Structure prediction request, 161 residues.
Amino acid sequence: VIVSMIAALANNRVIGLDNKMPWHLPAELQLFKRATLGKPIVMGRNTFESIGRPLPGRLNIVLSRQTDYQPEGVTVVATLEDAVVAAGDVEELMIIGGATIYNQCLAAADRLYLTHIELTTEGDTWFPDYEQYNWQEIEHESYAADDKNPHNYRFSLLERV
Ligand SMILES: NC(=O)c1ccc[n+]([C@@H]2O[C@H](COP(=O)([O-])OP(=O)(O)OC[C@H]3O[C@@H](n4cnc5c(N)ncnc54)[C@H](OP(=O)(O)O)[C@@H]3O)[C@@H](O)[C@H]2O)c1
Ligand SMILES: Nc1nc(=O)c2nc(CNc3ccc(C(=O)N[C@@H](CCC(=O)O)C(=O)O)cc3)cnc2[nH]1
Prediction:
C-alpha cells in the first residue's frame, strides 16, 4: 500500500491552533475531500475530535492508545502497524494527520498531498520539516483567493525520491 500524507500548511508550516484550523477555505476542504474520498484515512485522536465526526465515504481509522476509546462510526487502532492492517487490501492509504502522526510517518511517506496557504498565522501544531528529504512535484495547481476563499493557496503533489 502507498503511504500518502495530506495537509494544508500556512507559512512556517502551521496547520493548527487550539485543536482547530487557523483559517477557513471551503474550496480547499473540498480539495481534501476530493483527494481522500473512497480511501482509508488515518488520523490521530486529536484530529478526529477536531473534525467532530467520521468523514463520509471513507474508512475512518483513528489512532489512540486509550484502550477504551471508541467513538461511533470509526475504527480505533493502538499502533501505526495496526492502522495499516486496518486500511486493508487497498492501493493507497491517506494519513490525514495531526502533527503527531505526520511526524511519525514522514520518513515512510511515499507521497505528500500539500496545499500551501499564503498566510502567516499563530499556531500550536506544525507540519514536519519534509524538505529535509528529497521530493519531486508530480502535480500542482494555484488557486487565487476569491469570493468564498479569502486566501491564495497552491496544491502540490510530491513523490518521495
Ligand atoms: N491543516 C491541516 O492540514 C491539519 C490536518 C490535521 C490536523 N490539523 C490540526 O493539528 C492539530 C491536531 O494534531 P495534534 O498532533 O495535536 O494531534 P494528533 O496528531 O491528531 O493526535 C495525537 C494523539 O493521537 C494518538 N497517537 C499518536 N500517535 C500514536 C501512536 N503511534 N499510536 C497510538 N496512538 C497514537 C494519541 O492520543 P491518545 O492519548 O488517545 O493515545 C496522541 O495524543 C489540530 O489543531 C488539528 O486541527 C491540521
Ligand atoms: N489539504 C488539507 N486541508 C485541510 O483542511 C485538512 N484538514 C485536516 C483535518 N481537519 C479537517 C477538518 C474538517 C474536515 C471536513 O469537514 N472535511 C469534509 C469536507 C468539508 C465539509 O464537509 O464541511 C470532508 O468530507 O472531507 C476535514 C479535515 C487534515 N488534512 C487537511 N488537508
